[PDB]
């Protein structure tokens, strides 16, 4: 079942891949891995191939590596990145040292899309819907993305979208406030906060909270949604943060409609519901999907949830070689998704 491999050197790093991947082209250099674009002869599609960098260098890396392979292996949704293939040149566990991931290439990310055209309200609806449709799935599996922003959104010719690059346990502009200063532990509703920041930017054409530092940005967010009320304060477990918050000039939530005059009132209505300060009162992906704003795309019977995701591994305490063997096990056990 094992294919023929071939090696080459690009960007001073050796890649050993099955022959099915051709015309490899260095897309970028990253600290965690380096990614080549290639042509997958099997699927007839351009794909992305990630060679993970020093994946078993420390306990931390091994566990990081394991976590990503598990998470990627679990994702099976049209609006989320799928694992096309994962492989190692290694023929046994002892010689196992390198890991490559293959994922689909949609050619463009949301930043680049906005860069060369203006989006109709129709485009925005469809994009957000799909973000929300994927988040429903992700969240039902008890996963948090942890990083949503335009550059982790991949879009094609037909305006189809996939979510990519999950935070593995610029960016600040789309972060929820409760996690920007790490006020409390992360709810999956920080992702909803991100969607709100994205939607606004698509709608108006500008970054909503383009802060320069955490303090600058927090102040920017609080001018819109007001300062945290007494009920919210209690949830913050750090007294330092609390004392800090109480030092702030008290502020009322502003009226969104005045801030987004000329946008679809429904869109504004939905933004209102996503950009709620208290995370416990933010609309959910499931809830948001049913909003009138998406009347023309919403189908309850076609917005599926995920299987349960076992994350108990996270509280395991293993040797480097044990995380490594777990990972080899996942590489070995992968089942390629059915051909289209």
């Amino acid at each position: 079942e094992r294919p023929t491999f071939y090696r080459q050197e690009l960007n001073k790093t050796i890649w050993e891949v099955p022959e099915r991947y051709q015309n490899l082209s260095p897309v970028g250099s990253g600290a965690y891995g380096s990614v080549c674009a290639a042509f997958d002869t099997k699927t007839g599609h351009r794909v992305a191939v990630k060679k993970l960098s020093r994946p078993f260098q420390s306990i931390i890396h091994a566990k990081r590596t394991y976590r990503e392979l598990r998470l990627l292996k679990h994702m099976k949704h049209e609006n989320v990145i799928g694992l096309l293939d994962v492989f190692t040149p290694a023929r046994s566990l002892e010689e196992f040292n390198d890991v490559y991931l293959v994922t689909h290439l949609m050619g463009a990310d949301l930043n680049n899309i906005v860069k060369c055209q203006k989006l109709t309200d129709d485009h925005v609806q469809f994009l957000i819907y799909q973000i929300l449709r994927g988040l429903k799935y992700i969240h039902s599996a008890d996963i948090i993305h942890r990083d949503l922003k335009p550059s982790n959104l991949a879009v094609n010719e037909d305006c189809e979208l996939k979510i990519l690059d999950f935070g593995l346990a610029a960016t600040r502009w789309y972060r929820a406030p409760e996690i920007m200063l790490n006020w409390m532990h992360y709810n999956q509703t920080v992702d909803i906060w991100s969607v709100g920041c994205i939607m606004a930017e698509l709608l108006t054409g500008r970054t909503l909270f383009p802060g320069t530092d955490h303090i600058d940005q927090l102040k920017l967010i609080l001018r819109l949604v007001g300062t945290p009320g007494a009920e919210l304060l209690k949830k913050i477990s750090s007294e330092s943060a609390r004392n800090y918050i109480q030092s702030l000039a008290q502020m009322p939530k502003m009226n969104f409609a005045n801030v987004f005059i000329g946008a679809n009132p429904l869109a504004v209505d939905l933004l209102e519901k996503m950009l709620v300060l208290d995370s416990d009162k933010r609309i959910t992906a499931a809830q948001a999907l049913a909003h009138a704003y998406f009347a023309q795309y919403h189908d309850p019977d076609d917005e599926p949830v995920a299987d349960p995701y076992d994350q108990s591994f996270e509280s395991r305490d293993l040797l480097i070689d044990e995380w490594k063997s777990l990972t080899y096990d996942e590489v070995i056990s992968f089942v390629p998704p059915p051909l289209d």
Partner: peptide, 8 residues
């Protein structure tokens, strides 16, 4: 059938 232009 809404569509987008890809960046070149």
């Amino acid at each position: 059938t809404l569509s987008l232009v890809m960046p070149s």
